[PDB]
């Protein structure tokens, strides 16, 4: 069972009714536009109506580097390098201008966020705009791509080596020295992982959401 991440509300004091009525709109839009299962690291091709484009339609293919937001506003960022120029577009999943979302290559990566690809070699962000969709077998585990990227010379957009980021898909041994890695460890917070009161359990929330999703599919 894959529950799209935008369905799980963030912790807070929002009245549960607000999330229930928002889910009714997400499910009504999902039967008009098929929103497929995908993860950060998957290759997508998104088609959207554009008033000023040629043919009044635009297509963009890129790797998903971030999934964020909740509710109707949930978005995802696609990244690609076109003519040597890196480009990113933040798409709204439920924006009515979206005509199709095609999963060209379904896969997961070692990290839940690939923002550090902006600081990696361009090759890791380059994907052919006309690459053909690779078939996904039925009831198969989502492939996890264990690629570790090589980074450009510092400085980077962010301190990717810091513990708070918890990035596992970077070849730190090549780009950083041993003294530089020890300095980064000064920001480690070993007590954080054991702080039980920060844990956010969504098991019961997810179970109730699945019931609402199944009811909609019958009607």
């Amino acid at each position: 069972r894959f529950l799209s991440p935008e369905f799980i509300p963030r912790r807070g004091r929002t009245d549960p009714l607000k999330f229930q009525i928002e889910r009714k709109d997400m499910l009504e839009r999902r039967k008009v536009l098929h929103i497929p299962e995908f993860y950060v690291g998957s290759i997508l091709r998104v088609t959207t109506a554009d008033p000023y484009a040629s043919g009044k339609i635009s297509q963009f293919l890129g790797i998903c580097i971030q999934r964020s937001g909740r509710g109707l506003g949930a978005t995802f960022i696609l990244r690609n390098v076109i003519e040597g120029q890196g480009v990113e577009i933040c798409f709204e999943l439920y924006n009515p201008r979206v005509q199709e979302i095609q999963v060209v290559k379904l896969e997961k990566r070692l990290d839940d966020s690939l923002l550090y690809l902006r600081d990696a070699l361009p090759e890791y962000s380059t994907f052919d705009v006309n690459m053909k969709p690779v078939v996904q077998e039925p009831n198969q585990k989502v492939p996890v791509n264990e690629l570790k990227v090589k980074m450009k010379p510092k400085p980077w957009s962010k301190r990717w080596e810091r513990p708070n980021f918890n990035i596992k898909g970077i070849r730190f041994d090549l780009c950083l020295t041993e003294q530089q890695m020890k300095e980064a460890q000064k920001w480690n917070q070993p007590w954080l992982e054991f702080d039980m009161m920060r844990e956010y359990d969504t098991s019961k929330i997810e179970a109730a959401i699945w019931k609402e999703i199944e009811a909609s599919k019958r009607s």
């Binding site: 484009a53 963009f60 040597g84 120029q85 890196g86 990113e88 933040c90 709204e92």
Partner: protein, 115 residues
């Protein structure tokens, strides 16, 4: 996104923009009352010791949803009338610029790729 002192990248093929120089092209004025330039705004550049107007065709600052964000601050050199100095733009430029064909018709004619 692009303000005074911001160093920009000329994405057209004009000789003025691609000749080597010891100082990088720099914004010295934005033709906006708030002084902050976005895609489609004109700016004044200090380039090879000269003053030349340019049109912003991309920047790294996030914009509205569904709009492209670039890894560099891209500009195109133009004349005071709005004519492009170069003849070809290979770098992709946003389709949103096509809302301004009335004034930027000629600049768009030399754009090969749109995003």
């Amino acid at each position: 996104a692009i303000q005074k002192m911001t160093r920009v990248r000329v994405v057209d093929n004009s000789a003025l923009g691609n000749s080597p120089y010891h100082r990088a092209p720099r914004c010295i004025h934005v033709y906006k009352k708030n002084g902050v330039g976005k895609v489609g705004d004109q700016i004044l550049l200090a380039i090879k010791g000269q003053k030349k107007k340019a049109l912003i065709v991309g920047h790294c600052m996030p914009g509205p949803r569904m709009t492209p964000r670039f890894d560099s601050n891209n500009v195109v050199l133009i004349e005071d009338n709005g004519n492009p100095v170069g003849t070809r733009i290979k770098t992709p430029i946003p389709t949103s610029l096509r809302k301004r064909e009335g004034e930027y018709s000629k600049v768009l004619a030399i754009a090969q790729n749109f995003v």
